[PDB]
Every structure is written in C-alpha cells, then in structure tokens.
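Re: the multi-chain job from yesterday

Posting the exact lines I submitted so nobody has to dig through the queue logs.
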Amino acid sequence: MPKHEIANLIHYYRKQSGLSQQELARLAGVGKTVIYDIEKGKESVRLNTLLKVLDVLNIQIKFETPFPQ
Amino acid sequence: GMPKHEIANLIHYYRKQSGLSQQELARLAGVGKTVIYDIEKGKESVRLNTLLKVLDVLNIQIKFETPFPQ
Ligand SMILES: [Cl-]
Ligand SMILES: [Cl-]
Ligand SMILES: [Cl-]
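And the result, structure tokens for all chains:
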C-alpha cells in the first residue's frame, strides 16, 4: 500500500469533519501523538487504535480477496 | 464497525487456502512466526505495517469505505 494513503485518508476526512487532531484523539479514545504519527505517514500504529480513529470518521475497512470471484 | 475476529479468520483462511505454514507465511512477510500466531489468535495489537506485509503475501488489499462522496 502507498506509504501516505492512510496519512492523507485520516487528514482529509478529519479536516472535512471540522475536528482538530486533539478532538479526533479524544473522540477515538486514543493518544494525541497517534493522530500526529498517522497523518505524518507512520504505520507503526496498532490496528485497534487505527480502527477507533476510522470509526469516528465513519470510515470502514474492506479486504478485497483473490478468491472467489 | 469491524468485529474483533475479522482479521484472525481472514489471515487464517487465506493462509490455509494458500498451503502456507505459519513459519512459511512469516518468512515471506518478513515478520516473526509468533506474530502470525498472534494474528490468527485474534489480537488486534498487530501493527499496521506488519499487517500489510502479511496481506500483500496473501494477495489481500485494504479498501476503505468512505462516507463521502457518493
Ligand atoms: Cl493541519
Ligand atoms: Cl472497518
Ligand atoms: Cl474470513
């Protein structure tokens, strides 16, 4: 996956939601430093942490699979 | 809201269907074998970059459902 796909994904939909990164962190119940790191392109974020951020922004994850058709 | 064991069965099913052992999938993804064991047991503390290396070996890509635009 592109290195800044999720970075811009979180930033765009957070700015479009009017949330600061402190408000998005408080809503997701995660650390403030996590929002900074994600939007900077860092991918060492734990997934249960990332999903708590995505749900506040109403973004869900689909896995496209090689089979079946 | 993604359920707590979606990733565990996703990695397990497609690793079993690919004929790869836990250690075989770990060496391809460049991660520890215990990491593969922990993912399939359900723990979601797996790191994002760690997950992406496992998914890319299994030819699984992440797509995002966004609320806008239509
Ligand atoms: Cl900004
Ligand atoms: Cl999701
Ligand atoms: Cl599944």
